[PDB]
Design a protein around this ligand. Structure first.
Ligand SMILES: O=C1O[C@H](CO)[C@H](O)[C@H](O)[C@H]1O
Ligand SMILES: [Mg+2]
Ligand code: NA
Ligand code: NA
Lengths: 211, 210
């Protein structure tokens, strides 16, 4: 959840907002180790329920998100249902566990390609065009992350938009991401420069991957 | 002496606007068939399966024409080669279907078949069904028969399934055409087509358009 003024500004200037619970357990092995554990359900529930209680009156918020990169655990299913019951006015989405679990109203993959399948075991990223018409599938598809804009990038961006326009149930996506997470440091003359991972003696680090 | 007056055009022609040569005549086989007075007038074969296809029930509905009699029986027997695999016998008289009773001129036979050999375009396993109309003590009136392929065709979850597996149709449309004989078909031409189709990795054909 963002600084509270963010939603006020989105209401007034007009942007659709996905409001997301502060839950990410990416470094766990497997990714759902905590989110499938009922011991972590109280802590996860507060991150979801207190967000909803705070932001549910903002018209700019159109979709709730259960967080990101935490696999798919039973706790997600419980909290998905909690939101559906408490606030029927907004769809709930969540990408973890393969982007199309029972904890999401929207197929919301990250970096699934337009035409090319990436058939990873357990959590494949299907071509978005293919994903829509998998046997029994009926939901809309909106990429929660796509077109990773790292450095000299966004090659193939037009390919996404041709597909978005051609396919009714491909209803777009959210580019990753808006702003470089670089930090300012200064040389001996006081000239500022842009720093990334490792530049503060932080180790281990992931270098330029923050930008 | 038979006299047959064949018309090239009829009101039937309005329903026969296929993109093909427009021809006419007696272009398929003519035959004479002798049936007894008491006869098999229709029969339907169905095959249903359990979830993993390890058991089948062959269901055979048989209709008669002629005089109804208590001594009448139908036997449907199923053969794999020279081996009889299953058999059923019953008098005529179907189950009650409405307030007026049932079909006294019909009978349904049900045969259990364990581990049926399944039919597909890959392995065309066939059994032989023989439908015998006979008296209670086994005097045959007549027999009809067909080839039986044990297979289930169904659409589930948006997929066409044959024997529980999603098909991939390598199909072609095939008109009945011969450069010399026109729209007359013979066995040799038909066999030649099937061979060429299979040799070129086709598994399916559409009877375009009749
Ligand atoms: O759509 C069609 O196109 C073909 C054109 O050769 C042919 O006319 C077929 O009978 C018709 O079904
Ligand atoms: Mg036509
Ligand atoms: Na669309
Ligand atoms: Na990053």
């Amino acid at each position: 959840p963002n600084h509270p003024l963010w939603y006020t500004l989105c209401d007034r200037y007009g942007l659709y907002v996905v409001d997301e619970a502060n839950i990410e357990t990416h470094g766990m092995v497997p990714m759902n180790r905590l989110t499938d554990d009922p011991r972590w359900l109280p802590a996860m529930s507060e991150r979801v329920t207190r967000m909803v209680q705070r932001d549910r009156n903002h018209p700019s918020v159109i979709i709730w998100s259960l967080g990101t990169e935490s696999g798919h655990g039973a706790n997600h299913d419980a909290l998905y249902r909690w939101i559906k019951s408490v606030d029927p006015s907004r769809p709930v989405q969540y990408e973890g566990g393969g982007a199309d679990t029972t904890a999401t109203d929207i197929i919301c993959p990250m970096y699934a390609r337009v035409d090319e399948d990436q058939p990873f075991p357990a959590v494949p990223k299907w071509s978005i065009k293919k994903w829509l018409s998998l046997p029994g599938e009926t939901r809309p598809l909106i990429l929660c992350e796509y077109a990773h804009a790292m450095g000299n990038s966004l090659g193939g961006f037009a390919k996404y938009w041709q597909a978005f326009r051609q396919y009714p149930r491909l209803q777009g996506g959210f580019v990753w991401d808006w702003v470089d997470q670089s930090l300012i440091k200064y040389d001996e003359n006081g000239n500022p420069w842009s720093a990334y991972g490792g530049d503060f003696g932080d180790t281990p680090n992931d270098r330029q991957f923050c930008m | 002496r038979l006299a047959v007056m064949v018309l090239r055009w009829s009101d039937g022609s309005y329903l026969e606007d296929q993109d093909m040569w427009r021809m006419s005549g007696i272009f398929r086989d003519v035959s004479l068939l002798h049936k007894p007075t008491t006869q098999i007038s229709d029969f339907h074969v169905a095959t249903r399966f359990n979830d993993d296809f390890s058991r089948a029930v062959l269901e055979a509905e048989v209709q008669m024409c002629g005089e109804l009699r208590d001594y009448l029986r139908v036997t449907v027997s199923l053969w794999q080669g020279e081996t009889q695999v299953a058999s059923g016998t019953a008098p005529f008289g179907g189950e009650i279907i409405d307030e007026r009773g049932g079909y006294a001129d019909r009978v349904t036979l049900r045969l259990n078949v364990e581990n049926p050999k399944l039919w597909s375009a890959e392995i065309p396993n066939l059994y032989r069904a023989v439908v015998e109309l006979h008296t209670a003590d086994g005097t045959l009136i007549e027999a009809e028969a067909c080839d039986v392929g044990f297979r289930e065709v169904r659409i589930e979850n948006g997929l066409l399934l044959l024997n529980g597996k999603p098909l991939l149709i390598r199909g072609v449309n095939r008109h009945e055409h011969h450069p010399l004989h026109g729209q007359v078909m013979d066995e040799q031409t038909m066999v030649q087509d099937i061979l060429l189709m299979k040799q070129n990795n086709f598994n399916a054909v559409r009877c375009s358009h009749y």
